[PDB]
Amino acid sequence: GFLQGKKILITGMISERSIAYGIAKACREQGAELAFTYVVDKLEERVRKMAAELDSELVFRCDVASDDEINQVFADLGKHWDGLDGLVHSIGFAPKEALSGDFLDSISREAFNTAHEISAYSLPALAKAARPMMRGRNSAIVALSYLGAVRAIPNYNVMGMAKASLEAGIRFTAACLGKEGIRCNGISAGPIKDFGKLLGHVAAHNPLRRNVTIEEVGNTAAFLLSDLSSGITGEITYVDGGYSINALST
Amino acid sequence: GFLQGKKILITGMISERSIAYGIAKACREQGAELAFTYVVDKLEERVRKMAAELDSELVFRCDVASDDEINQVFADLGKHWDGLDGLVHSIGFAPKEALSGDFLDSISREAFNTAHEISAYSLPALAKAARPMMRGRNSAIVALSYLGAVRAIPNYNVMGMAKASLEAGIRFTAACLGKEGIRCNGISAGPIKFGKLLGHVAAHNPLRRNVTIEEVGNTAAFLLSDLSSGITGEITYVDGGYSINALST
Amino acid sequence: GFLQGKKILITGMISERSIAYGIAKACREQGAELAFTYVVDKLEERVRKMAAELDSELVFRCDVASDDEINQVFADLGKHWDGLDGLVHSIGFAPKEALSGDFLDSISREAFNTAHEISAYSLPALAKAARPMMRGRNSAIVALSYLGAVRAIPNYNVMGMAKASLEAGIRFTAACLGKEGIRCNGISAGPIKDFGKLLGHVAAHNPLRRNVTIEEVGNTAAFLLSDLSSGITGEITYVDGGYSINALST
Amino acid sequence: GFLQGKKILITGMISERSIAYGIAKACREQGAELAFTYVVDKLEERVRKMAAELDSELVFRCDVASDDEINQVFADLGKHWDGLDGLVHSIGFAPKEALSGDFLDSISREAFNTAHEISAYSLPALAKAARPMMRGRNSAIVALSYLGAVRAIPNYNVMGMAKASLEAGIRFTAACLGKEGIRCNGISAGPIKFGKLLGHVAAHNPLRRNVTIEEVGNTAAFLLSDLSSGITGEITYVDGGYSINALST
Numbered sequence: 001g002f003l004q005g006k007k008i009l010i011t012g013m014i015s016e017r018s019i020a021y022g023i024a025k026a027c028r029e030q031g032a033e034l035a036f037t038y039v040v041d042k043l044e045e046r047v048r049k050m051a052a053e054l055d056s057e058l059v060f061r062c063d064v065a066s067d068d069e070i071n072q073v074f075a076d077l078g079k080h081w082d083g084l085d086g087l088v089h090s091i092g093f094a095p096k097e098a099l100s101g102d103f104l105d106s107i108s109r110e111a112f113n114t115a116h117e118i119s120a121y122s123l124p125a126l127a128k129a130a131r132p133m134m135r136g137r138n139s140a141i142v143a144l145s146y147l148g149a150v151r152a153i154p155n156y157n158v159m160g161m162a163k164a165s166l167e168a169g170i171r172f173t174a175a176c177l178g179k180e181g182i183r184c185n186g187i188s189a190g191p192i193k194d195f196g197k198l199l200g201h202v203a204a205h206n207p208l209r210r211n212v213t214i215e216e217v218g219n220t221a222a223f224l225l226s227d228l229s230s231g232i233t234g235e236i237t238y239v240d241g242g243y244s245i246n247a248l249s250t
Numbered sequence: 251g252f253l254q255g256k257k258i259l260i261t262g263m264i265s266e267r268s269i270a271y272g273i274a275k276a277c278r279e280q281g282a283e284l285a286f287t288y289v290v291d292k293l294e295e296r297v298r299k300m301a302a303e304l305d306s307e308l309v310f311r312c313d314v315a316s317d318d319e320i321n322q323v324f325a326d327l328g329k330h331w332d333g334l335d336g337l338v339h340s341i342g343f344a345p346k347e348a349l350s351g352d353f354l355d356s357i358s359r360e361a362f363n364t365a366h367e368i369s370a371y372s373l374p375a376l377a378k379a380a381r382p383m384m385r386g387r388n389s390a391i392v393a394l395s396y397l398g399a400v401r402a403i404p405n406y407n408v409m410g411m412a413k414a415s416l417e418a419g420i421r422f423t424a425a426c427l428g429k430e431g432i433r434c435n436g437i438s439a440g441p442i443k444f445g446k447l448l449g450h451v452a453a454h455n456p457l458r459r460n461v462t463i464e465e466v467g468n469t470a471a472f473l474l475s476d477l478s479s480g481i482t483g484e485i486t487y488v489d490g491g492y493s494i495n496a497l498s499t
Numbered sequence: 500g501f502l503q504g505k506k507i508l509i510t511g512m513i514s515e516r517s518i519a520y521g522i523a524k525a526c527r528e529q530g531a532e533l534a535f536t537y538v539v540d541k542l543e544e545r546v547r548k549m550a551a552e553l554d555s556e557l558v559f560r561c562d563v564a565s566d567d568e569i570n571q572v573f574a575d576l577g578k579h580w581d582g583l584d585g586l587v588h589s590i591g592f593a594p595k596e597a598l599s600g601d602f603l604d605s606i607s608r609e610a611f612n613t614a615h616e617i618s619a620y621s622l623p624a625l626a627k628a629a630r631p632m633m634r635g636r637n638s639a640i641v642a643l644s645y646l647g648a649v650r651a652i653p654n655y656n657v658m659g660m661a662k663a664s665l666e667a668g669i670r671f672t673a674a675c676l677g678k679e680g681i682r683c684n685g686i687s688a689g690p691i692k693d694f695g696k697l698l699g700h701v702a703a704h705n706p707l708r709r710n711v712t713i714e715e716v717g718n719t720a721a722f723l724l725s726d727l728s729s730g731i732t733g734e735i736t737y738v739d740g741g742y743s744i745n746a747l748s749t
Numbered sequence: 750g751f752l753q754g755k756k757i758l759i760t761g762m763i764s765e766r767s768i769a770y771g772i773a774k775a776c777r778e779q780g781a782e783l784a785f786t787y788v789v790d791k792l793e794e795r796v797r798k799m800a801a802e803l804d805s806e807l808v809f810r811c812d813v814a815s816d817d818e819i820n821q822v823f824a825d826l827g828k829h830w831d832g833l834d835g836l837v838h839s840i841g842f843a844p845k846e847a848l849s850g851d852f853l854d855s856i857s858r859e860a861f862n863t864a865h866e867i868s869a870y871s872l873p874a875l876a877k878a879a880r881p882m883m884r885g886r887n888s889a890i891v892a893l894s895y896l897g898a899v900r901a902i903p904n905y906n907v908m909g910m911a912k913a914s915l916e917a918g919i920r921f922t923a924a925c926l927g928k929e930g931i932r933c934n935g936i937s938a939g940p941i942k943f944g945k946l947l948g949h950v951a952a953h954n955p956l957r958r959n960v961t962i963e964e965v966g967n968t969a970a971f972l973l974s975d976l977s978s979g980i981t982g983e984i985t986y987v988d989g990g991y992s993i994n995a996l997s998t
Contacts, residue, residue, distance in 0.1 A: 067359060109317060120362075124362075128357065137567065151747070152745050153744035161415040164415050165415040168411045172353045175402030175994055178989070183646065198747060202747070207981050208927045208981060209928050219977070220977065223976060228967035228971060229968065231965065231968065231987040231989055233955050233987065233989060235985065235986050237980065240979070242924065245651055245920050246650060249653065250693065258636065303512040375947070402990075404998075424741050428705070429707075440730070447996060450998045455677070462730065465730025469731065477716070480707075481715075481736065481737065481740075483744040484741075491901075493995070495901050496900035496902050499946070602922065603877040615914065619914075623853055659921055663912070664865065664911070671909055672850045675853050676853070677824070
């Protein structure tokens with residue numbers, strides 16, 4: 001496996017359906033050692049269980065709304081690990097009411113603020129807090145994005161703005177940390193397990209004529225966290241079966 | 251002129267150096283009737299003076315931090331105008347400390363929040379509040395962005411994230427309002443009066459010079475006019491070709 | 500009109516349906532003085548008639564396959580005009596058999612060569628030949644492109660490759676001539692008068708919920724040929740009613 | 750390795766400095782079985798030697814100017830291999846005179862034609878000829894591009910137009926073959942050993958250094974493997990972040 005010796009912290013793993021689980025599993029299959037965060041105490045047990053199946057006992061509470069908690073994760077993790085080789089940002093949130101229907105009717109100041117703070121600011125906040133552990137290690141950050149960053153799409157609404165902010169954050173973080181040997185890249189993932197019809201629309205219209213899997217996203221993340229991708233930084237890689245590059249599909 | 255009789259509300263005109271002034275002047279030259287906002291009471295007199303030179307007595311306070319104030323503008327403006335044909339978003343802010351040096355060292359939660367709220371959320375907030383006045387008129391919104399949206403650049407830092415959010419907001423607003431006959435477009439302007447930034451751009455862009463507020467202004471006038479009726483959700487680069495050049499030693 | 504005093508050469512005007520006619524008409528309405536090319540002698544009369552309705556007697560044969568003919572246009576035009584303020588490239592060709600069905604089955608070396616030579620090389624060839632007349636005049640070139648340059652689309656096939664070549668040509672030409680006061684920009688136009696269903700697909704899916712007109716393309720060209728756009732060069736402007744920036748339209 | 754048993758044809762390997770060599774080596778390290786093309790008979794021996802060090806005796810003449818030769822490669826290769834899992838396009842050419850100085854002064858019809866035919870048409874020509882061998886295998890094509898496709902750069906000139914054509918060819922090929930289980934992707938590589946170009950990039954990119962053929966090679970190996978099965982029509986930048994940086998004085 002090409003992540004032998006790599007130590008990787010993974011956010012956003014709330015179930016076996018989650019993108020972060022696909023990433024965790026892919027990384028574990030390539031020999032990485034893993035650690036995880038959970039946002040709320042209700043999920044702790046479930047996350048510890050998933051971690052254990054992935055050979056990890058390293059699980060930490062981290063509400064990315066809190067600078068203290070973010071920093072505490074790395075202080076606690078640093079007791080176990082000499083350094084951090086990988087960091088996976090797979091977290092986003094916006095109030096449900098802002099994520100459907102008319103873009104302007106559904107948006108509000110509060111939903112905007114929340115969406116950007118949790119979904120976009122969290123990337124540089126985590127990179128900043130991880131920086132002492134990651135610098136000088138030829139390490140890597142991967143963050144998950146979505147086509148709403150760069151295209152107007154139905155129902156994504158304010159999250160589109162937040163993902164665009166995130167994607168810029170990826171570029172700025174990469175430009176910031178490259179000299180210290182830390183890479184930062186994104187994956188714009190296609191939709192995964194109107195939602196049934198979204199999936200159908202994509203599978204009918206993309207070059208691969210199917211939806212992508214968490215394994216496909218996971219393996220791309222594993223590559224971007226590995227030294228195999230050492231020439232790549234500030235990149236958004238589309239794992240959508242070619243969807244974004246197709247047009248005029250009647 | 252090609253904006254003859256068009257009624258246009260312009261934000262961000264704080265001086266004759268401002269991008270918004272260049273836009274105002276360009277629109278006035280094409281026959282538009284103008285109205286303006288000012289952020290703080292200290293600027294009222296100065297903005298009323300500029301408005302008057304552009305043949306306008308329509309000036310309103312609007313701190314885009316305030317939903318009350320945003321909506322009040324359109325209530326007050328609607329007493330004078332039956333409808334609104336144009337809306338110009340030319341406002342942005344981030345704490346000065348967040349806009350130089352190392353990106354991660356200079357960033358903070360508060361500066362991030364402020365930068366996005368004032369610089370990005372303000373576009374959909376203004377479009378939303380203007381919607382009753384603008385819909386059904388084949389009207390137009392124009393917002394100002396910057397290269398930091400789509401490239402990592404030194405010293406722009408968190409504003410880059412905020413402009414990227416804005417540019418997505420332009421796309422989503424355009425997709426939202428197109429059916430009601432409202433367009434929404436952006437201009438990514440090159441730098442305009444840091445001395446070395448300007449010099450770097452003038453040495454490296456195809457035109458070998460910096461762009462002017464007149465050039466940004468005329469592009470805005472075009473994007474506010476019916477001449478651009480086939481264009482929406484677009485970011486147009488008025489940077490003398492800077493963004494499309496590379497590997498210039 | 501904002502093209503007062505401007506002298507503009509327009510290629511590709513073969514009928515009143517053509518994009519170039521929309522451009523000619525738009526430019527004439529803003530006060531430009533026009534000249535035109537025609538590729539084959541069969542069209543001469545028809546083009547002279549259209550020119551005359553647009554107040555022009557300046558019509559020249561120009562097969563862009565021929566360097567001699569390209570150069571001759573500017574030698575002949577230079578007898579009438581002190582300089583050239585505008586140049587509109589609205590020409591493209593590929594063999595019909597290469598423009599439908601499966602991309603690889605339909606492509607051939609010969610069709611590729613022809614498509615690129617006529618549709619892409621013609622831009623720098625025309626800019627080069629026009630350069631003595633255009634330099635120092637604060638003049639402008641506009642070329643027409645299509646979404647196939649930057650997205651995979653059905654049926655456009657090799658023309659997509661040719662348009663991508665063209666769009667790069669626009670950038671390189673702009674970078675080349677900017678110092679001499681010549682701008683070069685593109686318009687990526689949406690479809691205009693499976694073709695009936697293409698038009699329907701676009702009108703159902705773009706932000707404006709309709710197809711664009713030759714007037715809308717024409718007015719954008721007029722702007723890009725005018726001094727109002729003096730800050731803009733190397734740009735591709737999408738006149739497609741927002742189509743290219745939308746996605747996941749179910 | 751993650752290409753274990755994969756059978757991959759590689760073009761453009763003319764020396765150990767070549768991008769294609771970096772790709773070959775990276776693929777061999779992941780367990781791929783390799784075959785190679787050479788453009789001219791003068792290079793045959795040198796290419797056979799390199800192939801042998803990479804455990805291959807499968808080497809074929811292929812001047813991509815020739816449809817006969819392109820198709821012959823696959824007829825000859827098909828005698829040894831039941832099918833083809835990977836195809837690497839790492840070839841490009843334009844007359845030297847067209848690749849420096851003023852873009853319009855340096856360009857010509859002939860140089861344009863040659864550059865596009867050899868550098869761009871060769872991708873769909875090779876994909877087409879390989880299609881019977883590749884279809885139904887969950888196989889992959891990778892092609893090499895350069896920033897000149899999407900930015901105006903000094904000295905690349907007409908090759909920029911040719912690479913843009915290539916990148917569109919990658920998209921169209923991907924859209925064409927995806928249903929048959931063949932992917933097609935590109936790598937836009939940073940410069941690799943002009944001395945000042947390399948210096949400019951190393952001073953300006955996020956990584957503050959030039960990329961290596963190993964880095965390009967490993968990315969190609971990934972894009973040729975099933976690990977990348979969700980990715981097609983993509984251009985991946987292996988340039989140490991160069992293309993995403995701007996305004997660096």
